[PDB]
Amino acid sequence: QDGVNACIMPLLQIDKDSGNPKPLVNAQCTDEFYQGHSALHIAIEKRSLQCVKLLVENGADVHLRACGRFFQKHQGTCFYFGELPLSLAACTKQWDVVTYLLENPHQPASLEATDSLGNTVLHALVMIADNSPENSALVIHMYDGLLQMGARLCPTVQLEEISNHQGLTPLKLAA
Amino acid sequence: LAACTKQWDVVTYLLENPHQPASLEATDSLGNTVLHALVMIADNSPENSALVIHMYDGLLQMGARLCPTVQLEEISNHQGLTPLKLAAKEGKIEIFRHILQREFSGPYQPLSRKFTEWCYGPVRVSLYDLSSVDSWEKNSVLEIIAFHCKSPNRHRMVVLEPLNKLLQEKWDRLVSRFFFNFACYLVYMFIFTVVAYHQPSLDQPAIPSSKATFGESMLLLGHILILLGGIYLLLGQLWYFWRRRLFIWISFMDSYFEILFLLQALLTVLSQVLRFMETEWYLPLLVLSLVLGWLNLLYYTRGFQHTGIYSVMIQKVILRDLLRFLLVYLVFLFGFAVALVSLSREARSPKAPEDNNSTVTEQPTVGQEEEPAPYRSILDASLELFKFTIGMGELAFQEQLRFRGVVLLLLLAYVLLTYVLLLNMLIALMSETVNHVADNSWSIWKLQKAISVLEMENGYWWCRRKKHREGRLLKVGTRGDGTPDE
Amino acid sequence: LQALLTVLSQVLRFMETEWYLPLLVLSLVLGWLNLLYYTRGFQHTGIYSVMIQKVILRDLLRFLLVYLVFLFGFAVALVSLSREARSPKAPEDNNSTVTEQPTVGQEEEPAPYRSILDASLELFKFTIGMGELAFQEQLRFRGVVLLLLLAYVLLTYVLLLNMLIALMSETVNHV
């Protein structure tokens, strides 16, 4: 509905007299399919900007795992998403909300962070990337900007040094 | 014809007339409505295709605006064919592709056929309808591509997404149980060959028991099982014949294994007849039934992946080059065969003024059981030279005694131009078929998979099925946002 | 399998019976067979060795399911026709206790024929094109078997022999 979520405020303040305000904004979905799922995830999925800005200014967390049965692979309909709004935010090229989900009035996004299977933004971007050269070029240049502001706003952390739960670097997993 | 000539000024005008709006649902002389006129006039020219699609779509747009509330595609012709059935009947994958590709972004939704629910940017989910497979009150869709088959192309139309994906998932969900059919048939043919192998060598047929034991009683069980399944093969082909009405009227041998099955079944019921007459000649007929069933094992290769692709490959090149190499083989080798029967063998009198053919096919109403083409006392030497003719035995002479040096260089001429110089020809141009049929063999592969599957459930005595809306996952990457207004 | 057959060779040689030798010839053909693993080294022959590794690794079982099955079927067709004393079977030991060697393997007279055991290993040795044209007490009423062998030799011997060579040449067109 034109990207403008207006109800950031009223259940946050009903959830302030009853006291669940970041719990209003960060209610991870307890569905099996939509699991671990916050509204910031939707705000990225709807590709809009009010939703991210007054969802984050509604207090939305950034490092939060969305270990959804909708959101991981089977070789069937459900495929891996990023499972955390920064991860899928990069996996959807959305530098406005990668940039925003860093630049938040509450939270810089942890670049070195991991996800549900251990599948970090390295494994999310790589694992979502296939031989589509549009997909390849976006998952390379978008990842490179994530290493550029990823080496500017939060430098001094070697992200590729991290291996997964299987002990694989993004060089090892991409390879 | 106004739509068939793109003339939207006079389609528009011939609607908007001060006297008469044009009836959209109307039919024509053969029953061939604007559906059948536009489709039937449309050929694979992409200018013709694009005009007969977009012009037809505008006819559905003002065709859905000035006169809405009439479902034109619902109409079938005099033959009972919808425009989906007719466009999917004259082999136009482009138009049928438009029909299931159809998607109207205007009020309101269910004109479309490719719906996208639980869809997503990376993750598209293209929902379909499978009215192609729900068309049971008329024929199914592969039925009407197959009838009439291949006005330009019959094998092409399966590769489109409901037909191909549906033909995949129905096999991998139901009809991968075809191994039970091949299992029962394989055990059947094993029973045939072990009864044939372990038969008694006694001259009198219908022996009571070789021995009252596990052996001969087991052989009686194999006999009763083997004709007890043969009657089921006869029941299957009679359902195929009364129900399917293939083969074609005056046409070629197509399809091959059907009439090969009819000749095996004919020869084995004649085997049953003369076995009921209790003479010894039931057995060569049994070996013929053996070689046609063990021959017919390759029909059961339609199942699984690299071997089904391989099975359609050998189905293609073998189905083409069967008679093509036979007209080389039988004719060159019959000619030069007769040339070798004249040279050389003494006692050259099977003919003329006697019974020349020794009453060829001497068996009344059983077939070619005689001494047909009786030779010049070289009958055994002539079946034997025909057995030399695939390269076995060598180099005899006789009372010619090497004055037939002309026959020597003569055989150097036939063996020259035929044995090497023509042997490389048909292999090479069937390799040109390989240069052309290889991608087409994929269309033949998905088709023959869909005939094993679709004919399998269509025959199965008396079957179940499952009919629910298709949906196809797509993981492709491209931009494009928006919504169908929720 | 070479190592297994040669340590069984060592076992039965330690039992000191004569049958150590056919196992030795099998070890020979699997090692001299295994010489082509040592072709991985140098340039035109290593390129060549990977070529034969590719087309041989693909078309091994693919030609075997044609070969063993067509030739087993028509083989049994020739064992039934023709040889007298057709009793290895049924109600006796049909298989003559096939693989009669306990824990050594297929050492027996397996698939005992219709007194054509030597004529059946011998027709299997004819089956790669050696010997010819015998008859027996059928005595040319098996003209049906004549044209029948013209049918199998027709569709299989020439008409199918060109198939797999051609589509492995399609593999050559791709690999």
- What is the Cα–Cα distance from B350 to B280, expressed in whole angstroms? 26
- What is the Cα–Cα distance from A150 to A156, expressed in whole angstroms? 10
Choose from C163, C165, C168, C172 for mutation: most chain B CBs within 10 A. Answer: C163
- Interface check for B424 against chain C (CB to CB < 8 A): the answer is no
CB neighbour list of residue B479: distance below 8 Å, 6 or more residues apart = B121
Q: Are A25 and A37 in contact (CB under 8 A)?
A: no
Q: Do chains C and B touch (3 or more CB pairs under 8 A)?
A: yes
Distance to chain A for B131, nearest Cα, Å: 23
- Interface check for B193 against chain C (CB to CB < 8 A): the answer is yes
Question: Which SS3 state, helix, strand or coil, does residue B278 take?
Answer: coil
- What is the Cα–Cα distance from B370 to B348, expressed in whole angstroms? 19
- Which chain A residues have a beta carbon less than 8 Å from that of B121? 47, 92
Q: Taking Cα atoms as reference points, which of C173, C172, C174 lies closest to residue C56?
A: C172
Question: Which SS3 state, helix, strand or coil, does residue B82 take?
Answer: coil
Distance to chain B for A77, nearest Cα, Å: 6
Out of B280, B322, B431, whose CB is closest to C166? Answer: B431
Distance to chain C for B112, nearest Cα, Å: 40
Out of A77, A92, A135, whose CB is closest to B473? Answer: A77
Distance to chain A for B101, nearest Cα, Å: 21
Q: Experimental technique used?
A: cryo-EM
Which stretch of DSSP H or E encloses residue A29? Answer: strand A29-30
Q: Are B300 and B223 in contact (CB under 8 A)?
A: no
CB neighbour list of residue B152: distance below 8 Å, 6 or more residues apart = B43, B44, B91
Per DSSP, the residues of B376-421 read SS-SHHHHHHHHHTTT-------TTTT-THHHHHHHHHHIIIIIIT
- Interface check for B390 against chain C (CB to CB < 8 A): the answer is yes
Residue numbers of B between 277 and 296 with CB closer than 8 Å to C? 280-281, 284-285, 287-288, 290-291, 294-295
- Which chain B residues have a beta carbon less than 8 Å from that of A134? 477-478
- Interface check for B310 against chain C (CB to CB < 8 A): the answer is yes
Tell me if B123 and A79 make a contact (CB, 8 A cut-off): yes
Question: Tokens standing for B373?
Answer: 């083409």
Taking CA atoms, B429 is separated from B256, B333, B440, in Å, by 22, 21, 16
Question: Tokens standing for B364?
Answer: 């009344």
- Interface check for C68 against chain B (CB to CB < 8 A): the answer is no
Which chains does chain C touch, 3 or more C-beta pairs < 8 A?
B
- Which chain C residues have a beta carbon less than 8 Å from that of B362? none
- Which chain A residues have a beta carbon less than 8 Å from that of B123? 77, 79
Choose from B117, B123, B169, B172 for mutation: most chain A CBs within 10 A. Answer: B123
Provide the Cα torsion B60, B63, B67, B69; round to 10°. 0
Per DSSP, the residues of A30-87 read ESSSSEEE-HHHHHHHTT-SHHHHHHHTTT--SS-----SSSS--SSS-----SSHHH
What are the residues facing B471 on neighbouring strands?
B127
φ and ψ at residue B472, rounded to 5 degrees:
-120, 120
Out of C89, C91, C144, whose CB is closest to B211? Answer: C91
Distance to chain B for A66, nearest Cα, Å: 17
- What is the Cα–Cα distance from B371 to A28, expressed in whole angstroms? 90
- Interface check for C74 against chain B (CB to CB < 8 A): the answer is yes
Out of B216, B218, B390, whose CB is closest to C153? Answer: B390
Q: Are B285 and B293 in contact (CB under 8 A)?
A: no
- What is the Cα–Cα distance from A128 to A119, expressed in whole angstroms? 11
Q: Number of C-alpha atoms within 13 angstroms, CB side, residue B129?
A: 14
Q: How many CB atoms lie within 10 A of CB B70?
A: 12
Distance to chain B for A52, nearest Cα, Å: 17
CB neighbour list of residue B133: distance below 8 Å, 6 or more residues apart = B140, B141, B162, B166, B467
- What is the Cα–Cα distance from B393 to B385, expressed in whole angstroms? 8
Angle at the Cα of A93 (from A90 to A95), degrees rounded to 5?
Answer: 80
- Which chain B residues have a beta carbon less than 8 Å from that of C155? 295, 318, 322
Q: Taking Cα atoms as reference points, which of B289, B300, B292 lies closest to residue B195?
A: B289
Q: Are A29 and A37 in contact (CB under 8 A)?
A: yes
Which chains does chain B touch, 3 or more C-beta pairs < 8 A?
A, C
Taking CA atoms, B385 is separated from B342, B407, C142, in Å, by 12, 16, 16
> Which chain A residue shows the shortest CA-CA distance from B125?
A77
Resolution of this entry, Å? 4.0
Question: Which SS3 state, helix, strand or coil, does residue B291 take?
Answer: helix
Q: Do chains C and A touch (3 or more CB pairs under 8 A)?
A: no
Q: Can you list the alpha helix ranges (DSSP code H) found in B88-160?
A: 93-101, 141-145
Out of A47, A79, A135, whose CB is closest to B477? Answer: A135
Tell me if A79 and B477 make a contact (CB, 8 A cut-off): no
CB neighbour list of residue B281: distance below 8 Å, 6 or more residues apart = B274, B363, B366, B369, C141
Encoded amino acid at B476, one letter = V
Tell me if B285 and C77 make a contact (CB, 8 A cut-off): no
- Interface check for B182 against chain C (CB to CB < 8 A): the answer is no
- What is the Cα–Cα distance from B122 to C92, expressed in whole angstroms? 68
- Interface check for A77 against chain B (CB to CB < 8 A): the answer is yes
Distance to chain B for C24, nearest Cα, Å: 35
- Interface check for A45 against chain B (CB to CB < 8 A): the answer is yes
Q: Taking Cα atoms as reference points, which of C77, C68, C64 lies closest to residue C152?
A: C77
CB neighbour list of residue B445: distance below 8 Å, 6 or more residues apart = B308, B309, B312
Q: Are A48 and A95 in contact (CB under 8 A)?
A: no
Question: Residue B401 burial by CB count (10 A; 0-12/13-18/19+): exposed, middle or buried?
Answer: exposed
Question: Tokens standing for B370?
Answer: 């005689």
- Which chain C residues have a beta carbon less than 8 Å from that of B297? 69, 73
Taking CA atoms, B456 is separated from A140, B37, B302, B321, in Å, by 49, 35, 12, 28
Choose from B125, B473, B485 for mutation: most chain A CBs within 10 A. Answer: B473
Which stretch of DSSP H or E encloses residue B472? Answer: strand B471-474
Q: Are B93 and B157 in contact (CB under 8 A)?
A: yes
Tell me if B383 and C163 make a contact (CB, 8 A cut-off): no
> Which chain B residue shows the shortest CA-CA distance from C85?
B201
- What is the Cα–Cα distance from A86 to A102, expressed in whole angstroms? 8
* Pairing status of strand B471-474 against strand A35-37: unpaired
Tell me if A45 and B481 make a contact (CB, 8 A cut-off): no
- What is the Cα–Cα distance from C27 to C5, expressed in whole angstroms? 7
Question: Which SS3 state, helix, strand or coil, does residue B115 take?
Answer: strand
Distance to chain A for B473, nearest Cα, Å: 6
Q: After which residues is chain C broken (C to N over 2.5 A)?
A: none
Which stretch of DSSP H or E encloses residue B125? Answer: strand B124-127
CB neighbour list of residue C67: distance below 8 Å, 6 or more residues apart = none
Tell me if B477 and A47 make a contact (CB, 8 A cut-off): no
Residue B371, sorted as left (phi over 0), alpha (psi -120 to 50) or beta, turns out to be beta
- Which chain B residues have a beta carbon less than 8 Å from that of C169? 431, 434
Q: Are B471 and B128 in contact (CB under 8 A)?
A: yes
- What is the Cα–Cα distance from B23 to B2, expressed in whole angstroms? 13
Q: Taking Cα atoms as reference points, which of A48, A133, A122, A62 lies closest to residue A91?
A: A122
Q: Taking Cα atoms as reference points, which of B381, B452, B415 lies closest to residue B174?
A: B452
Distance to chain C for B459, nearest Cα, Å: 29
Question: Which SS3 state, helix, strand or coil, does residue C20 take?
Answer: helix
- Interface check for A138 against chain B (CB to CB < 8 A): the answer is yes
Taking CA atoms, A7 is separated from A3, A19, A43, A45, B219, in Å, by 12, 16, 13, 18, 84
